[PDB]
Design brief:
The protein is mainly α. The protein has one helix at residues 13-37. This is Cytokine receptor common subunit beta. It is found in: Membrane.
C-alpha cells in the first residue's frame, strides 16, 4: 500500500487494538489489586 492511507482504515486497527490492551491490562490489574482484598464475593 503506497497511497497515503493516512486513515490506516476509516477504522484504524492499531487504535482498535490499543483499546483492547488498555482494557486487557485494566481487567488483569483489577483482579490482582482486588486479589489481596479477595475482591468481593458480592453474593455474601
Amino acid at each position: 500500500g503506497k497511497r497515503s492511507w493516512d486513515t490506516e482504515s476509516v477504522l484504524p486497527m492499531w487504535v482498535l487494538a490499543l483499546i483492547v490492551i488498555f482494557l486487557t491490562i485494566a481487567v488483569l490489574l483489577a483482579l490482582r489489586f482486588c486479589g489481596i482484598y479477595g475482591y468481593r464475593l458480592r453474593r455474601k
